Each structure stands twice: as C-alpha cells, then as structure tokens.
Design a protein around this ligand. Structure first.
Ligand SMILES: Cc1cc2nc3c(=O)[nH]c(=O)nc-3n(C[C@H](O)[C@H](O)[C@H](O)COP(=O)(O)OP(=O)(O)OC[C@H]3O[C@@H](n4cnc5c(N)ncnc54)[C@H](O)[C@@H]3O)c2cc1C
Ligand SMILES: Cc1cc2nc3c(=O)[nH]c(=O)nc-3n(C[C@H](O)[C@H](O)[C@H](O)COP(=O)(O)OP(=O)(O)OC[C@H]3O[C@@H](n4cnc5c(N)ncnc54)[C@H](O)[C@@H]3O)c2cc1C
Ligand SMILES: CCC/C=C/C/C=C/CCCCCCCC(=O)O[C@H](COC(=O)CCCCCCCCCCCCCC)COP(=O)(O)OCCN
Ligand SMILES: CCC/C=C/C/C=C/CCCCCCCC(=O)O[C@H](COC(=O)CCCCCCCCCCCCCC)COP(=O)(O)OCCN
Ligand SMILES: NCCc1c[nH]c2ccc(O)cc12
Ligand SMILES: NCCc1c[nH]c2ccc(O)cc12
Lengths: 425, 425
C-alpha cells in the first residue's frame, strides 16, 4: 500500500505525484493509456511523415501561467513565439479592416460600451468562491442571448462570437455567457487577454515537459485503467480493469471530469455532484490541423465561417504548410474532406487542402471530451464542489480549476492544492 | 414694465426671449455688447481680409445636441462636415501609430482596463442631480493625480491628457477629474464621444442662427450693460450702466457665470452660491487660429506639446491655410509669435507661421472667461444650485447646464427649463 495513489498521468497527476514524492511520500501513479501527458499530446503528423505536431493543448503565456512558467524554468525547457500573424483574411463583412484587431472606427463607440458591460459583468466573479456561490445565475444563459443584448454592430459582434466559439469549443447557442465571463476573469479581467494568451509554444513539444516531470516519478504503471475507488474501509482500495487492486491512504483523481462517471466510487460521491458528473460538461472543441498548398506564411482568418478561426500553424516546406482551424465537433465533421475544403476556401480561395489531422477527444474513452466547458445552467448550480475532496479522495485537473480552467496552468494549480492538503492531512 | 427681462443675448438668452415671446409674453432683451451671439462669435479673420472665422464655439453633433439640431432644422440652416483629418503628425513618442486613434497594440490591455475604470467612475454621475449631491468628492481632485492612478503606458496616457487639456481648457494639475468624468457622462457615457462630437460646423457661421433667432425677438437693446438686479419690491428693478432702469415680473440672467459677480443683486444671492460666484470658474480655454504656409490639408496633431492639439481648420488658398490650436491662457501667451512658431514647429517643422488670430475671452469684461470648467473642489460643493432660481431671478446658460455644460446645447437646455418654469409660475 502507498501513501497516495494518483489516477491519471496528465500534467495534474504528474505534478501531484512528483511533489508528494519529493515530500517523502510513497506514491503510485496509475495511467490508463500507453502514454503520459493526457490532453497534452505531441506525436508525428498523420499528413506529414517525420513532422511533430501538437494535437492537443499547445499554447502558453508566462504572465497568465506562472506555475507553468516555473516548470519550464525548472527543467530548462525552451519555448518559442507562436507563429506571428502578418496576413489577415477575415470574413467579417465589407467594413472590417484587415488587421488583427479588425474593428473599424465606425464601431468604436459600440465597442467602448460593450467593453464596459463585459468587464462589469466579469468583475462580478470572484475566482475563489465558485460559480455556484455568487448569485450569478442571471449570467448563466446561452451566449447568443447574452450577445444579442449587447446589440453590437456587425464586425465586433461576429469577431466576439468567432473567438468565443474558438475558445469555448461550443456554438453560441450552447455556450454559457457566464463561462465566457469566467475566462475573461481568469485572464486578469481582460477580454483581449483571452486571445493574447496564445503567446508561446514549446519548441520541442509538450512531451519535453511531460518527460522531465515523469523522470522524477519512481513508480508509474501505464495501461492501467481504474474502474473502482472504494474508501469504505480504513485504507482506500483502487480496483483496476485487468489486474490486482492497489491500496493507499489517499487517492487523487487526476482524470478528466467526463470520465469520472465510468468509475464506481464507494461510498457514492456527494449527491450534489452526481448529476453533473453523469451528464458531463458540454465542451466540444475541435482542433484540426490542415495540410495545405498555396498558403503564404502568417495568415490569420477570423469570421462567420463554420471555422470561426483559421490560422497559420507551421511551415512544412516552401510551398506547403499546416494551418489550424477551430470549430466544434457537434457542428462539423472533420472526416468530410470536402467540407473541410469548403470551410477553408471560404476564407482562402487560393488554398488547396492536402490533408487533415486531428484527435477525436470525444470518442477517446480515456477522455470523452476536449477541454472543459459547462453546459448552460451547469456551473451556477455546482462547480466549486466538483474539485473538492470526498473523504480521502481528491479531485484535480484543468476541468475543475477555479483559477484557470481549460488550461495547463489549471492542471498545475489544482494539483498544488491537493498536494498541500495531503501534506497537512 | 415687461413680463420678463432677459439679460444677455447669447444662445440661451435668445432662446428664452424668443420662446417667452411666442408664448405671448412681453419680453425685453438687454445685451451689453454691440453684437448678439456671445461666445458664439463669427467675424472677419484678423489675418486674412475677407475671410469669416469662428472665434468661439464652432462644432456640433446632432445626436448629442438635439435641441441645437432642432434650431438648425427650424430655420433651414445649413451645416457641413468638420474638416476631415487625413494626415497625422502626433507627438506621442516612437511607439505611437500615425492615425486618429494612435494607440498601439502593445497598449491595448492597459486601455481596456482604463476604459472600464473611466466609465465605471463616469457612471457614478447622475446628470439630473448635480455634482454636489452625489457623494462624488473623492473624484473632485486634480486630473493629473487621477490619471497617475490609472497608471497608463505612454501613448494612451499622453493622448488622454492632451485631449483633456483641449476640452477642459485647463492644464492637468488644475482640471478636476470629476469634471472630466462629467463630460464623459454628458456624451452618453463615452470617452470617445467627447472627441467625436467635433462632427459638424455651420456652413455660414453661427451668426446664421443668431440672426434667425433674433428676428423673432421684437425688443432688443444692445450696448446695455446690466449693473443691478433688485427684486426687493413687488416688481423686479433692473439697473443699467448709462440709462434708465427697466422693470419686470421676472428676470433671466443669461450672462456668463464669471460676470455675475459684477452685478449687485438685492437681496444678496443665497449664501451657498456666493463664494463660487466671487471666485469664478477656472476655465482658461485658449483657441488660436493660425495662418500658415507649407501645411498640406487634413493634418491632425495630438501630443505632449504646449499645444496639446493642432489641426486643420480651413483652406485659405492653395499654399495657405488656417490651423487651429488649443491650449490654455494661463500656460501660453498668444501674442508671442515666436512661441507660437516653436509650438507649431514642434509638430510641423516644415510649416511657416504667417499670423495668429484669437479672442481674449478672459480680458473681455462681458465674459471674463471662455467656456466653463470648475476649479478643483468647486462643483462637488456647489453646482446644481448655481442654475436654480433665486426668487423671480432665473439663471441660465452653458455655464450652468447639468446636461451639456460648455456647449451650445447646454445654453438651449437651460433656457428651455427657465421658460417652462416661468410659463407655469
Ligand atoms: C484540442 C485541445 C487544445 C488545447 N489547447 C491548450 C492550450 O493551447 N493551452 C493550454 O494551456 N491548454 C490547452 N488545452 C487544455 C489542456 O491541454 C488540458 O486542460 C490539460 O492538459 C488537462 O490536464 P489534466 O492533467 O487535467 O488532464 P489530462 O491531460 O486529460 O490527463 C488525464 C489522464 O487520465 C488518464 N485516464 C483517464 N481515465 C483513466 C482511468 N480510469 N484510469 C487511469 N487513467 C485514466 C488519461 O489517459 C490521461 O493521461 C487543450 C486541450 C485540447 C483538448
Ligand atoms: C473658444 C471657445 C470655443 C467654443 N467651442 C464650442 C464648440 O465647438 N461647440 C459648442 O457647442 N460650444 C462651444 N463653445 C461653448 C459655447 O460657445 C458657449 O458655452 C455658449 O455659446 C454660451 O452661450 P450662453 O448663452 O450661455 O452665454 P454667452 O454666449 O456667453 O452669452 C452671454 C451674453 O451676455 C452678455 N453680457 C455679459 N454681461 C452682461 C451684462 N451685465 N449685461 C448685459 N449683457 C451682458 C454678453 O455680451 C453675451 O452676449 C466654445 C466657447 C469658446 C469660448
Ligand atoms: C476629456 C478626455 C477625452 C479623452 C479622449 C480620448 C479618446 C479620443 C479618441 C478619438 C479618436 C476616435 C477615432 C476612431 C478611430 C478611427 O476613426 O479610425 C479607425 C481606427 O479606429 C480604431 O482603431 C477602433 C478602435 C476602437 C476600440 C474601442 C476603444 C475603446 C476605448 C476608448 C479609448 C480611451 C482613450 C484613452 C483611455 C479606422 O477605421 P475606419 O477608418 O475603417 O472606420
Ligand atoms: C471569449 C471571447 C473572447 C473575445 C476576444 C475578442 C478580442 C480579441 C482581440 C485580439 C486582437 C488584439 C490585438 C491587438 C492589436 C494589435 O496587435 O495590432 C495593433 C492594432 O491594435 C489596436 O487597434 C489597439 C486598439 C485597442 C483598444 C482597446 C480595446 C478595448 C476593447 C476590447 C475589445 C472587445 C472585443 C469585442 C467586444 C497595431 O499596433 P502595433 O502593431 O503598432 O503594436
Ligand atoms: N492548441 C490549442 C490551443 C487553443 C486554441 N483555442 C483554445 C481555446 C481553449 C483552450 O483551452 C485551448 C485553446
Ligand atoms: N470651436 C471650438 C471647439 C472646441 C474645441 N475644443 C473644445 C472643448 C470644449 C468646448 O466647449 C468647445 C471646444
């Protein structure tokens, strides 16, 4: 038996396991898949043999992500500027200006006013309290109705919605306005900063950091899928798909929220949590890497397309590139390459699609989801509690960060908190 | 004796006199100068024989100034676009961009945040209540300290201050932050709109409208300076510099605030008002028309100069133009043409100054002031009351508008209110 079993070897699980280990605890990390890193996933391109791509989370920003910054600095891991945008090919109507901030002067007054409203509303959110504990139900409504009430003129309206679609991985009619304001709050109460935090990448991929952290963890078992967590007795018993149980004083669940429903907890989790857990969050972020010919470097496209955003990812050769598109998986089928072509050509009619690459996060039984975004109505009923212990079982991860959900920083933040709690208990 | 004597033949006095007349009242208008219009003053250029210039207030904006819009529409008076700016020659440092909105992307986050703060603060102001009745003393502090607390980076900082200097006619250390927020409030809670309201001019000058209104006023006496207003008896007695008194049931003071102290009121005005009246407001707006050679059309310059703003006014010929500069009269001497040259050449080193033209509003005994701006501490002690009746004596004018002070619209607004009050009393 161990002092702690950690379930899940994403960044959250890795940090917790590492830190408990370094604190002198006896730790086992159980990871259900064949790799470490979780929703941080670097691997070879499907389209471009020999080329390493990030298929999940990729971007960071040092001033918004100090814990992550500290990890990079600790292991001497190199970062690079995200691809600079020098060419703008928006679809935001005839009045839009082709630069990164495409709002024209005729919309300036409207944007001023919306800026006040958005930030006023965001400033209602105290990041420590939880979205259910703050009288915020009035904001937990579909994003499209919230945005309809701002009544923005066409460019700023569509610009806002496009980025929101990108960032939440939901169409406007399914996103919650409250969660959008939560992201704004998380970025130091900045709308702009939500997008500006696409600031740096890992020079050699996220696996750099995954590997650095894992090297400090002495006991890891891959291909070990947890099916049961039973704290009915004096010591927690952790059951496993094809294997003998493991035992520990504490257990940290560092798996994705939408997988929790596939574990049998004994006794059952507190009843306030159960229906959100059963239903899962609503995130449907879909990130497509698109192999192209005929695109020049440095393109950014934002607009009203089925791809709200389409922009430069990497140079493949002198004629060839990867672009990245964001949409959602409920609205778009990535295996329909004709559809992909239509979506690309909308913005970029000179561009030939050679190929697409993506990971089906939703179909992956170890995830059942990309990054977190709540269904409408969900987080103003229960949010904070999802990330709180039940007895000796801790819940961590990006999905449950109050401070930085949906980002790697939130994985690190939640782990830090569980670690500290254990070292006192 | 009359139903009403109106003292002052600016736009306020003219409206009141006209409207009372049309309501069937017996009205006398007493104007101390040789002309009607007051701080709206079109006349021939001192520099350019044959050329008509506005030496006082010139600009309007129809959506912020509905009463003025109604006057123009009533008399069929034509307006034109203010001179469009197509060339930008700012002095806001090396990071500024040469367009009308010169803030660079690196300052965007800071501007976002300041935008929230400025508008939050402005939104404390209810325009009907008066600046003394709203618990706003904390904002009534020098503008430079208010702006120091926003802690803006260099371009947006200096851009804000320059326009504030323009608009208030005070240097930052003497302007009140509260009054700046009042202007923001007056423009539908818009910072931007303060500047955007420089939207149209009178095609043929303000005298167009002055003349139209005066034609509807049957009794006017020019060169008639009021020295005394005595409501001790049943009927008000109005004494006059070199002349027989006049009598009326009501009297409307439509002279500038800073002239009130040169009238003997009997009985004395309510004592809360008296010290502000004695001291006068702090406005020192200085508008200089500058005759130039070597300037191309469409120039706008904003910066850190002794002239915060310098921009295109009118074409004089193919080589010659008028520019307009704003500063204040405490900081700059307009009769020092060498100084003028230095101020111009700062922004525009290719430009030869031929001549300057201005009116000394401060030295003019019928004004003792350009447009209103309070001294620090003044309007959060007494503001609303300055524009309220004392007995049968009414006080009107731009200077005392709660809704649009410092503008022609406020003259019209205050008059409307006095008229209505009289027609009921
Ligand atoms: C398309 C996409 C793009 C993204 N882009 C960014 C970005 O740009 N910047 C950013 O900061 N973040 C990004 N993210 C968000 C970020 O990657 C994740 O929020 C984060 O990595 C989650 O880490 P975690 O430790 O909470 O969980 P995960 O990384 O999901 O780790 C959970 C682990 O649990 C394992 N597991 C699941 N079930 C079991 C079981 N029963 N037993 C044992 N193990 C199990 C999984 O295999 C996995 O390794 C992105 C995510 C996606 C999906
Ligand atoms: C340089 C400058 C630029 C401006 N630019 C703009 C602008 O762009 N847009 C805008 O809307 N506004 C502008 N204004 C503000 C606007 O012009 C004034 O606020 C407005 O015209 C005031 O009108 P009023 O009727 O309140 O007073 P005034 O126009 O000042 O009229 C007062 C009248 O009282 C008379 N008078 C004084 N003492 C006596 C006495 N004892 N007896 C008899 N008569 C007396 C004066 O001769 C005068 O005719 C500007 C003002 C200045 C000074
Ligand atoms: C009393 C103090 C007053 C202070 C005044 C400062 C603000 C004055 C700004 C005046 C310039 C407005 C011109 C609009 C731009 C333009 O015409 O030309 C535009 C460029 O304008 C823009 O960049 C739009 C951005 C607006 C974003 C909203 C800003 C809200 C924050 C307000 C900023 C606060 C100021 C400092 C804190 C070109 O697009 P078009 O030619 O294709 O069409
Ligand atoms: C979850 C929803 C998120 C919604 C995101 C929408 C906002 C994303 C904006 C991303 C673009 C930022 C780039 C900055 C500009 C740039 O880099 O390039 C800049 C041009 O940028 C500007 O025009 C500055 C104006 C900023 C004014 C402040 C705006 C505050 C209001 C926020 C707007 C609200 C959005 C809609 C309501 C060029 O100067 P530089 O090259 O010489 O240096
Ligand atoms: N690598 C993908 C980065 C990314 C783009 N848009 C996003 C929105 C949310 C998020 O967590 C991450 C992202
Ligand atoms: N004609 C001058 C217009 C003008 C320029 N700046 C100003 C500031 C305040 C004001 O009332 C008027 C103005």
């Amino acid at each position: 038996m161990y002092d702690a079993i950690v379930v899940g070897g994403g960044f959250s699980g890795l940090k917790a396991a590492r830190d408990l280990t370094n604190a002198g605890k006896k730790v086992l990390l159980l990871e259900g898949g064949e790799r470490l890193g979780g929703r941080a996933y670097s691997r070879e391109s499907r389209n471009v043999p020999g080329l390493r791509v990030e298929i999940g989370g990729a971007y960071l920003h040092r001033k918004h992500h100090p814990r992550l910054a500290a990890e990079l600095d600790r292991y001497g891991i190199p970062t690079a500027a995200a691809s600079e945008f020098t060419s703008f090919r928006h679809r935001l109507g005839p009045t839009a200006v082709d630069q990164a901030f495409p709002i024209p002067g005729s919309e300036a007054v409207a944007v001023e006013a919306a800026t006040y409203t958005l930030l006023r509303d965001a400033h209602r959110i105290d990041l420590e309290k939880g979205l259910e504990n703050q009288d915020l139900e009035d904001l937990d409504i579909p994003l499209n109705e919230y945005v309809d009430k701002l009544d923005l003129p066409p460019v700023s309206r569509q610009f806002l919605l496009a980025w929101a679609w990108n960032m939440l991985g939901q169409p406007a009619d399914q996103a919650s306005a409250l969660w959008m304001l939560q992201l704004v709050a998380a970025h130091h109460y900045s709308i702009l900063g939500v997008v500006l935090s696409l600031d740096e990448v890992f020079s050699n991929g996220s696996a750099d950091l995954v590997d650095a952290m894992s090297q400090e963890i002495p006991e890891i078992r891959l291909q070990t899928v947890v099916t049961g967590i039973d704290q009915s007795g004096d010591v927690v018993n952790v059951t496993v798909k094809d294997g003998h149980a493991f035992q520990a004083h504490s257990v940290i669940v560092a798996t994705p929220m939408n997988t929790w429903r596939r574990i049998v907890f004994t006794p059952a989790l507190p009843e306030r949590r159960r229906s959100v857990i059963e239903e899962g969050h609503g995130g449907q972020g879909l990130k497509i890497l698109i192999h192209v010919r005929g695109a020049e470097a440095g393109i950014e496209c934002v607009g009203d397309g089925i791809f709200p955003t389409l922009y430069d990812y990497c140079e493949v050769s002198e004629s060839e590139r990867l672009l990245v598109a964001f949409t959602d998986s409920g609205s778009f089928d990535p295996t329909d390459i004709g559809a992909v072509k239509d979506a690309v050509l909308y913005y970029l009619p000179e561009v030939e699609v050679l190929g697409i690459d993506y990971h089906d996060w939703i179909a992956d039984p170890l995830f059942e989801g990309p990054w977190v975004a709540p269904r409408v109505g969900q987080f103003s009923r229960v949010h904070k509690e999802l990330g709180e212990p039940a007895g000796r079982i801790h819940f961590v991860g990006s999905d449950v960060s109050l401070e930085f959900p949906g980002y790697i920083e939130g994985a690190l933040e939640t782990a830090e908190c569980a670690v500290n709690a254990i070292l006192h208990s």
